[PDB]
Design a binder for these strands. Structure first.
Ligand SMILES: Cc1cc2nc3c(=O)[nH]c(=O)nc-3n(C[C@H](O)[C@H](O)[C@H](O)COP(=O)(O)OP(=O)(O)OC[C@H]3O[C@@H](n4cnc5c(N)ncnc54)[C@H](O)[C@@H]3O)c2cc1C
Length: 456
DNA sequence: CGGCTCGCGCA
DNA sequence: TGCGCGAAGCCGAT
């Protein structure tokens, strides 16, 4: 539908109907940003063709009760900066509270919407909201993949077994879908408070706050400043200062050599395509560039592939046949230790390395990538059953990780526990043929004592 | 049949 | 640290 720099393969039709005479409405759910947003740019293009203005709507659901203040304040403060950003472009932002299946449907009829566009997310609840919205509206409904460089329905048509199978498919379509982002043209036609929503939600999440012995909060919110402007600053410092040493020090939690982009990438405050755009043009270590590109392009977008083609991505059924048979055969094996969710959450295990990894999670909200595997694999080794291990790993991840409730999390948890996108290894006790990690193995790769002493 | 995102022994 | 090997099941290029 019109546009020169717009790839039609990024947008697909969810519902057909006669185009309305009112302004087009963009349902911002996953990509919370103004710049480098294909969904917002496409919505403006439809608005320009029909000589109507564009408007952005955000529906605040009750999902924040499951999570904590750390994700609520991160998302809410970014939205406050987002509201000012669209105001400079004469784009109004409307924030609702309630079920999207009824709030968005009512808003379309009340505002007399002409075209409805939303971003793409492979989550189960996102599809449920779309189906409820479709039955409640009679206007065209579109969906744009503004999160992945290559659209999820275009990269692959089936669930990918391993990364080596998905590697050639993604890199083959890169020269077409890797382009520059055109500027967002301001609106030509002009036509709840965000502070009150933050205050009300915080009070409802105060009892569930993670506290210390002296009733002191554990979360440290000064590590990551939320917002679109700060996300660019984090990416800028990574390329200039940390990209050169990424390829050799990304497995060292004692060194802050990671991009620290997941909290911004999860909420959509920065575009992964923009990050790839600047990294490809940077003169850095070729090994470091290849290692990082395989992380933000291959494994990041294969998590969407895993969740899109596997509705049970957070279940034992999603595990492949060889993993299920191995885990089932070792169900009756005696575990060395058995810890409950409360003991795992408090970091009260016999392993000081595991406790240190949990302490980093509770304090900063972003545990190091290498220690995340050992954090999740040891849960399986010290749990009643593989189903309980998956339950605890998901619960702790979605509650304390700033990048939690993301396809990158469920795929990562399934990789560590169920071996998704992995292969079989030496047969062992309890864990069976799932990939095994040991405390001594971490000793030969990084200074373990420094990591434990940093987080008690 | 070749190649895959651990621990382990050895410079 | 860095390198080669072991141990394991399976996709897919043919
Ligand atoms: C058990 C487990 C749970 C995880 N939980 C989450 C989660 O809740 N949310 C989340 O976004 N990521 C999660 N990860 C994936 C990964 O650990 C994080 O993306 C990364 O550690 C965040 O730090 P970083 O962005 O600075 O790392 P970087 O090395 O800078 O990563 C760059 C980017 O690449 C992507 N990426 C990196 N590693 C992975 C990976 N293993 N799988 C998929 N994409 C990746 C992310 O978008 C990340 O922002 C989890 C991994 C595991 C093993």
């Amino acid at each position: 539908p019109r546009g020169s720099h717009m790839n039609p393969k990024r947008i697909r039709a969810l519902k057909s109907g006669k185009q309305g005479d009112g302004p087009v409405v963009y349902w911002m759910s996953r990509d919370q940003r103004a710049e480098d947003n294909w969904a917002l740019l496409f919505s403006r293009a439809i608005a320009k063709e029909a000589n109507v203005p564009v408007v952005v709507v955000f529906c605040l659901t009750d999902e924040f009760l499951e999570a904590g203040i750390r994700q609520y304040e991160f998302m809410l403060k970014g939205l406050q900066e987002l509201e000012v950003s669209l105001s400079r472009k004469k784009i109004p932002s409307f924030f609702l509270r309630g079920d999207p299946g009824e709030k968005i449907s009512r808003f379309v009829k009340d505002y007399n919407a002409g075209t409805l566009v939303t971003d793409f997310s492979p989550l189960r609840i996102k599809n449920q909201w779309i189906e409820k919205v479709i039955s409640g509206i009679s206007i065209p409904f579109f969906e744009v993949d503004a999160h992945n460089v290559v659209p999820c329905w275009e990269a692959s048509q089936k669930h990918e077994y391993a990364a080596h199978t998905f590697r050639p498919k993604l890199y083959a379509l890169l020269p077409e879908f890797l382009e520059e982002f055109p500027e967002l043209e301001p609106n030509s036609v002009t036509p709840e408070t965000l502070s009150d929503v933050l205050e009300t939600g915080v009070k409802a999440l105060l009892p569930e706050r993670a506290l210390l012995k002296n009733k002191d909060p554990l979360f440290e919110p000064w590590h990551f400043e939320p917002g679109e402007k700060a996300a660019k600053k984090v990416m800028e410092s990574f390329i200039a200062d940390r990209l050169d040493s990424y390829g050799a020090l990304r497995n060292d939690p004692t060194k802050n050599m990671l991009s620290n982009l997941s909290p911004y990438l999860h909420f959509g405050q920065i575009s992964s395509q923009r990050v790839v755009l600047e990294v490809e043009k940077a003169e850095s270590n070729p090994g470091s560039k290849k290692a990082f590109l395989d992380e933000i392009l291959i494994w990041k977008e294969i998590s969407d592939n895993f969740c899109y083609y596997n509705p049970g991505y957070d279940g034992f059924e999603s595990f492949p046949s060889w993993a299920k048979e191995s885990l089932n055969a070792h169900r009756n094996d005696v575990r060395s230790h058995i810890y409950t969710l409360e003991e795992f959450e408090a970091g009260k295990t016999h392993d000081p390395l595991w406790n240190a990894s949990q302490m980093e999670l509770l304090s900063t909200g972003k545990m190091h990538g290498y220690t995340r595997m050992y954090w999740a694999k040891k849960i399986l080794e010290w749990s009643e059953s593989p189903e309980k291990a998956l339950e605890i790993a998901i619960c702790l991840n979605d509650r304390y990780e700033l990048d939690g409730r993301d396809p990158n999390g469920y795929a990562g948890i399934a990789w560590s526990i169920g071996g998704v996108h992995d292969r079989a290894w030496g047969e062992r006790e309890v864990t069976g043929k799932i990939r095994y990690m040991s405390y001594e193995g971490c000793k030969r790769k990084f200074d373990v004592k420094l990591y434990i002493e940093k987080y008690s």
